[PDB]
Every structure is written in structure tokens, then in C-alpha cells.
Amino acid sequence: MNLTELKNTPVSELITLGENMGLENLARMRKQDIIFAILKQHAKSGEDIFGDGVLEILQDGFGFLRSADSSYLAGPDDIYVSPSQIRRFNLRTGDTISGKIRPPKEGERYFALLKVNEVNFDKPENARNKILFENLTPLHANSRLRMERGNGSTEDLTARVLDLASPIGRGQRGLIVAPPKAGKTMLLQNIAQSIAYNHPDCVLMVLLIDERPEEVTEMQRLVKGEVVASTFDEPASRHVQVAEMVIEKAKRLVEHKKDVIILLDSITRLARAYNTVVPASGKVLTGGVDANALHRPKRFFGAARNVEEGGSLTIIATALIDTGSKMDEVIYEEFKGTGNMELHLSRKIAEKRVFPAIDYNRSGTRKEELLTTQEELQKMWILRKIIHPMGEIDAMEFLINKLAMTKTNDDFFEMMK
Amino acid sequence: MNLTELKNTPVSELITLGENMGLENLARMRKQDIIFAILKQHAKSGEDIFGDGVLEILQDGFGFLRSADSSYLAGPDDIYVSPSQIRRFNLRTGDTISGKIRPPKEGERYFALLKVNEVNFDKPENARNKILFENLTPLHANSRLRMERGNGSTEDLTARVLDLASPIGRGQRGLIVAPPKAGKTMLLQNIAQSIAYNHPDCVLMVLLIDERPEEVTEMQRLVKGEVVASTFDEPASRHVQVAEMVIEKAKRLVEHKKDVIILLDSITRLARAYNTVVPASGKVLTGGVDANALHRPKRFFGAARNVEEGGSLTIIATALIDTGSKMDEVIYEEFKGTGNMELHLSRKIAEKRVFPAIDYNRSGTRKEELLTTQEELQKMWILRKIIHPMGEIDAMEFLINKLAMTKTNDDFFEMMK
Amino acid sequence: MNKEILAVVEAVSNEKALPREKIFEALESALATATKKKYEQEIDVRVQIDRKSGDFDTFRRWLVVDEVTQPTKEITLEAARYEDESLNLGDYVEDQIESVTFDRITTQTAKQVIVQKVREAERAMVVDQFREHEGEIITGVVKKVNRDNISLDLGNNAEAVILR
Amino acid sequence: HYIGDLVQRTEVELLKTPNLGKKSLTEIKDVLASRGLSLGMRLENWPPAS
Amino acid sequence: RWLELGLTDEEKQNQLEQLAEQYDELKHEFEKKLEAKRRKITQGDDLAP
Amino acid sequence: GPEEITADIPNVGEAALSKLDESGIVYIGAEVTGGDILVGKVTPKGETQLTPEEKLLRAIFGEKASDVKDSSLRVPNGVSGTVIDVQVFTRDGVEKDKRA
């Protein structure tokens, strides 16, 4: 009996399972109470339980193990852990842990962690032998993360133009600058699909902050990877909470020498949240943002880097512009020169229903010479020189046509000669 | 046991060293806690410690010695100094000091300075015999700081055009005016390399305010000199703090009759910081900048001058333009006529991937007659007259070609006849 | 606690007539007298209540002299090699920390010395602002008469004395 | 051991002694000098008669 | 304070884990007793309307 | 207004209040032979809403605390001895004094 085995299957399986186990009507309870009562009644038969979850530090000293079913929040099935385990086995926020668990004992209300078996997909014996995040030596991206599928499907174009507009690498810092309703969602979905297909070794995670529930439920079953989200049903406290959860998970995983890739949507919602949960410090500028209200977005974004010993943390967030409110603009303003790679989507191109609507020369990547080879770089320069004198819209159409004629970009490059 | 000996070596050496000294796992602590615990356990064996650092005045009276590892910030390894030492030995902000130190005594938490041995690379006996900064008589720059390497490497062109576009001298006031992603970083790196090679006697320092961490880590190991930086991971309080630290260090060093050269990148970030930490005074103009929010940038920049008794302070900062926000523009506006030397880089030239992209006639140096000789000045006038009727881009290409044919600028000048 | 200290400094009537800095200085004198009356030995103590950043923290003044009477506040002019003095005079230590400043006798002496300090400060202020007009005719009603001196009020609690 | 072996010793020879910092030095200077005498004096009649 | 050790899994790890579990369970039980005593003695009693 | 167990007893000197603590209760071990106020009970008689600013002001400046009635409990005239233990019970909701 593992926690994830009830964590991932839908509510219907839980219903039939509890109705089989001779339960009070479980349809009256929440998913977390469903799993809680089922694990209760299972342990009441005399089984030792196993479980897993991501740790969250509390200010009282003890920690709590959350799951991705609750999007890393407080729930009845969260596993309590004493501060002394956090001491001995060197635990902290982001450390995903799986091991021996039991239901809350007599008078308690939360599961207890008995025996640690896996710390961030590692032996708990070597978990104490880890390197911190701030002591890391960041670098530029050297390894290329090819986004092209090569099968030549209809939507795959929106990926190939990636390899032609703004290259990506392990540990890249990317900002999506686009007005609302321009095609950021389909772009992000294709990004996630291409990464999960071509690079299944690196862990893939996605942030949805203040989004619509339909987008969340479509995302959680379109990508091959564990996703976390937070709609507008919930206060910004939930958004900042899941923000620490995901960022510390990525930090601990990259400390374990793993390549993490986070796709955040959108950074404007996260900035609004961080501004509304931060108290007033008397420092107000245009838009209604506190001066220290942006320190947390700056932290979350500067978390991205390329480690030298092994592993990297790529952070690709989308920002919203042209939303009519100057406050949003100011956000994008401080995020203007902070990223070394940008995807600029103009609404003028998306207005003609020609996708993908990407502004070529307004997009680019800093220090992209270390991500690609010499032939590829020279061909990129030639393509930029060919596309520069023309405008945005039908020039993007020209790129789309030249991409649709060839199967992969090798034929396109050879034809460009 | 000196503080710098643990200050400069990477985190890995600290790890093996503490693991040798029979320590609690030091991998769980920060660099500052690493050095703190190692110095603790070393003094626990009975050794008197030596240390060094730059002094910072606090409003309570006492002072604190910071290092360049923390970028001159508060840390557990900062050395506390009483106000009475600041009285007797005449200490102030910027005075770098090295001498006898001990760990914090019983109940304290910061190192104490026992015995002063070196004040700004001088005897503490003559440290009281110093000249102040504002009592200095500034002048123009007379000594030429030749930036040309003479070896004729591929990138060295971006330095030789310096000697052809805008001459530099000891105590010069230079402003880099360029849009984002035009090539300011490589230019600044070449500037630092050329100065550290041709003039290793003058101290070289660089300011990075609200930059990317990859640029910081690439800068700190490309130049032959102690660098300080501050990324966007940190609030503007850190930026202004390191600003006083570096400016007072330069001031005290030039008071000690030393030639200081500071390369600041970028002054737009520093202006944003100074504006966001300054309280509102009810005086707001276009862009969202307070009227007194620019007094601190004006102070930091006017700190540059050429001293007559000996030494000088050259300050070369880069400003950002064409960033879409009028506020930035207004900053550049008040910094339009304040500098006597400017490097104008137009994005129109950088758009063709031809480097260096420098606007020749839009750049220039005021009172440059005292920096160069008569032959050199006449040849500069002739070159300006030859380049003036032509445009920016291919005229810069013409200069690049005429520079690449010859080895140093002597052959170029002789050929121009 | 320190919240009570802030409530006291904010609940004063004559706020600018006795500002936060001198208020906290008077409170430092209060806590110093309290700590003096705590120990049977006489020892000078500075407080530095940290007006807005933090709480109070008592210390131990030395009053460096070549005497030895009550060595709690005695140290020679040459003791500077260990304990990190390096001075000639003014060497004071920060050994004792975190005294109590809210018990009965502490509250009593605090209230008394605060009353004394505020009345003295306000009298000196209302006299000093009239000092610039020395050698001028002023108006004002008298307050009380006596066989040795009389009192006069120049407005806004301006006390003046006229001797026989 | 004896008090007479300590009264003829100026405090200059105490903070140089190990394990003599703040609490120990304060206790010594308090409990010894509060009895009227002090720490550090010049006398020759010692020890009579041992 | 350094109960952390490990070698020869088969039986040593089993016994060490059993004893560490007993230790943490004892500590948690004593902490529960202390918290119950605290909540009991700090609970205000009714006096009169 | 409800009653208070503070130590601000007006219309009396310090000798009768020297045996009272910071909270308003006689110390543990403080002897008493005659009628002496060993607990500072005061009750408001007239208008309520005495501002906390003016409340602490009366303890330092201004006039005496009026709405007190000096209804404090003292030992009867005739009994002596030394108090050895003090008991206090606070209803759920009232601010627990520091002696409790």
C-alpha cells in the first residue's frame, strides 16, 4: 500500500475500491479524505504503509510531506516529520522523500514518517553528501536541447521555428513576451511535448499560476510529466506556497546532479501574487507595486543557471504585455534585460490566424554561440540577414512556408544555400 | 591562518579542508558559515588569527569589515571594529585594513580586530597623514592610458578603435551610450583585459549592478583583478550598499595617492536602484523618478576626477537607451552633458553582426588635446574628416578593415598619409 | 516589553517638546539607575534601547582610571592587550546583557526619573526659546507672590522668576 | 592557594591566565574587592609563618 | 548524538533501524505527554457567571 | 467596566504599596502584621473608555486614576503572618497576568 498508488488513479477507482472495502459512503468526502479514510481502514487490518512526498519546512521546526494531487498544499493525508529527522538526514524544502509511513497514532491527525528509503531518487545514506545551490558556479548553456521532432507533423512547425529563432540549452534563461490570446498555451504544450519526447532523462515540470481549470486539466493529461498548477479559485498565498514548493524541488533535484526544466505560466500572475501577499513597505512606484514586491520574482527567476559539476536548471516563464494596465508593463519592464533568451510574439501576427506568431528579429538568444556549431550559427546569421529587411507578418509566413516544404531543418538549411 | 586564504579558494577546497579537520558536515552551511566554522575550530586549537577587509561605517558608531566574497555585505565572518579604533587610527568607509584578528569572544558573534597592520596598503602609522577627497583640486586628464595591445589578435581591434575613437586618460569621465544587446559586455571585458595588461600598477575594479549571474561568474575569472558585483537576486538595498562600498574604497585608495579605474555596468540599473530606495519627496517628473532620486547617481559619477598631487579616479559607466520605457531615457537625459567622454554604440551597426559597433563622430572626448601629442591629434582630425561624410555602418566597416590590415596603429597612421 | 516602550514613546503628550531620541535617552538613564539599584555594587551601564530596530541591551562601563575602588568600574589606562581594547582611555566592556526593566522598583524609578527629565527638559526649552530676546520688554501675567520672589507666566507654560 | 599569594599579584597576570575571560574575571574582582581589600598590592611580610 | 552508522546491512541495518524507531517513538511520546501537560495546566478553569 | 488587579492604588503612599509586585499581588514571602493591601483590586465607578494612552499617562503624569474606588482587598485587622503561596484562576478570555 503506497501513497502514490492512490495518488494518481482517478476518483472513480477510489470510489469502487472503498465500496469494495466495505466503507462509509466515500462519495461524501474530498479526495484527501478519501485516501485518508482508505489508508485508515487498510492499516486497521494490520499493514505497514509506504508513502512519498515533497517536504515543506514550517517555522515551528517540524516538516510536512505534500503531494502533487494537492498541488503541494496542506491536506489530511500530509505526512508529518519531526525536526530531528530533518537534522540527522539533512532534510530541507524540496527534498522529495519516500519510505515507511504509518497513519497518525492515538490522538494525532497526520501520518508519521518512520523510515526514510529514497531522498530525491537517491539513497538516504548519500543524501547528506550534497552540494548547495548558492555555492554553485553558474555558467552559460553549452549542451543543445534540440526541440525538433523530425517527423514533420503539422504542428511540429512551431517547434522547428524554435530551432530557427531562439535556441534553447540546459540551464537557459527564457522569457516569453506576448499579449493575451496570441498562442502561448499551444506553444508551451508543444515545448513540453518535444522535451518529453526528445529528452526523457531530464525531469520536466510546469507552473500554472492563476490559470483556468480547463487549461490545467488539459495540461495534466497532454504532457508526459508530473505537472503542478494553481488556478484563480485560490488566494495568492497558495500561489506563493506552490512557488516555494516547485522552486525548492528543482533546487534539490539539481543539487542531486539532475537537469530540471521548468515552464512557468505566467510570470505576470506570479508577480501580481507576490505583490499582493507582500506587506506595504512605503515604497510605491507606478502601477501599484511595492519596491520589495519584486524581490521574490527576481529570486525565482535568478534561480535559473547552468551548473558546472553536473546538472542544470532551465527556467522558461511567460510574461503578459499589452493588457491595458500599466502595472503589468512595469513588471515586464524590470524583466526586460534580465533574461538572456526571449520569445517575442506580436499580436499583429496572431491577428491573421497564422501560427506560430513569432517576431523573429525581436527574438534572440544571448551567448548562443556556445549552444550551436559553426555551420548552424553561420546559417542562422544568413537567415537573419534574409529576414531582417522584410516585416513581421508575411516574413513569418515566408519562414512558415520554407519550413513546411522541407521535412527537417537540414533540408531547409541546404535549400537556403 | 589569514582570512583571504580562505576567501579566494573555491568551495571545494573548503570542503576537503574541513573534512580533513574533523568537522561536522560543512556542506550543509553557507560559504560564510564554512569559513566561520573553520576559523572557529582553528582558533579552538590555539592560534592567533590574521584577517583583512574593507571597513563600513554604521550609524551606531562601530564599524564592520567586509570581504569581496560577500560583495561587501553583512555576513557571519565580518570583523567587528569599535568606534574608538576608528577615532584613534582615523578610519572611515573604504579603508581596507589587514591585521590581527580573533573570533568573537564569549557571547559575541563577530570577529574582533586586535591590531592594525595595513591600512590601504600602507603603514597604519602614516594612515592618519592622508588628504581628503573633496579638498582635492581636480584637473583634466594628461597622462595617456594606451589601450592597444600591439599583438594584433582578432578581438584586439575593438581596443585599437578605442585609441582611434575616444581617448582615455587617468581620471577620465566616460559614458557608454548603447541600446541593449549591442556588445557592451565584450567591450567592457576587452577594456578590463587591456588595462590589466598594459597598466598593472593601477588598481582595477568593476561594478555589476542588477546583472545576470552567468555574466558575473564569467567576469570574475576573465580579468586580472578583484571584481565586485550584484545580480538581480538581491534588493536594491544591496546595490546601493555595494555602491557606497566600492566608491569609498576608490576614494580612500586615491587619497592614498593611487590610480583607481572603475568600470560600472550599468548606470541605468544603479539609477533605478537609487530611485527605488529613495523615499518620495513629492517631486515627480516624467518616467517616475524622484527629483532627489538622481542626487546619488550624480554623486557617484562626479566622484571621478584627476588629482594634481598624485593619483586619479577614472569612472567609466555604461548607460542603457532605446529600452522602450521613457524613464530610462530621462536618466540618460540628465547624463547627456555631464560626461566629457562618450562611447556611442548604435544598434543599427550591431544589427549587421559587425563588431565593434561604435558610432565614430557621435563619440568623442572633451579636452582630448592634453591626452595625446600633436602628431596623434592631427592624424585624429584627418581621420575624423575622412570618416565624417560617410555614414555609420559601412564607414565603421571601413575603419575595421583599415585597422585589420595593419598590425598596430603606427602603420595605420603612416598608411593614412 | 519593548512594545510597551514604543507605546510609551508614542503616547506622550509633548511629543516634539521632547523627541524620541531624548525620550529614549531618559529611558536609558532610567534603566541604568534601575540596574545600579539592582546590584549592591556600583557600576555604570549604558542601554542603547535601539529606538526602532530592536530592544534594549545593558552593558558595563569601565571609567578607565588607575584606581581600584569597586573594580567593577575600574580598569587601568594600560589594560589593552587582551579583551581587545588597544586604547588609552574610554575602554568600556559589554559583558552583562539583557537586564529586567519592567518589575516594581524598576517601574517606580523609571516613572520618577522620566517625570524629572521631562519637566526639566520642557522648562529648559521654554526658557531657551525666549533666551534669544534677552534685553527686551516682555508682557505676561504673574502667577504667585511671596516675600522673597514672584512667578510670572509668559504664555504656553512659560515660567519666569522675579527675585526681591 | 593562599589569599596572600594572590593579593601580591596585579590583575595584569589574570587575563593572561587561560580560562579567565569575562564571567570569571568579574566574579573574582567582585567577591575579592568587596571585602575592603583589592587585587594587586606590594607587601613583604608573607607568609608568616609557613 | 551521532547514532548514524552503517555497515553489513542484513542484520546490522535491521537492528539499528529498529532501535532508531524505538528512540524516535519514545521521544515523540514524551513530547506528546509534555504538550498534553502544558495544555492541561494552561487551560483556564471556569469560576462563575 | 470590569475590575482590574493592577498596582496603581491612588490616595495612598508607597509604604502601603511597597509589598506589592509589578502585577499587583503581594510577593511570595512578604510578611504582614496589620491591615495592608496585598492585592490591587480597583473598580470603575463612572464613565468607561479610559484611553490606554491617558491610562499610562495617569501612571506617570496628570491626576490620579478616578474610577478606582480603592476596593482592594487587605488582610483583616488582627491577623498576622507571612504569605507563603498565592493562587490565581483566570477565565478563558481574560488577559493572563504575568504572575499567573
Ligand SMILES: Nc1ncnc2c1ncn2[C@@H]1O[C@H](COP(=O)(O)OP(=O)(O)O)[C@@H](O)[C@H]1O
Ligand atoms: N500552433 C498551433 N497549431 C494549431 N492551432 C493553433 C496553434 N496556435 C494557435 N492555434 C489556434 O488558436 C487558438 C489558440 O487559443 P489560445 O491557446 O487561447 O491562444 P493563446 O495561448 O495564444 O492565448 C486555438 O483555438 C487554436 O486552434
Ligand SMILES: Nc1ncnc2c1ncn2[C@@H]1O[C@H](COP(=O)(O)OP(=O)(O)O)[C@@H](O)[C@H]1O
Ligand atoms: N568582439 C566581438 N566579437 C564577436 N562577437 C561579438 C563581439 N562583441 C559582441 N559580440 C556578439 O554580441 C553578443 C553579446 O551579447 P551580450 O554580451 O548579451 O551583449 P550586451 O551585454 O550588450 O547585452 C554575442 O552573441 C556575440 O556574438
Ligand code: BEF
Ligand atoms: F491565454 Be491568452 F493569451 F490570454
Ligand code: BEF
Ligand atoms: F547585457 Be545586456 F545589455 F542585458
Ligand SMILES: [Mg+2]
Ligand atoms: Mg494562453
Ligand SMILES: [Mg+2]
Ligand atoms: Mg551584458
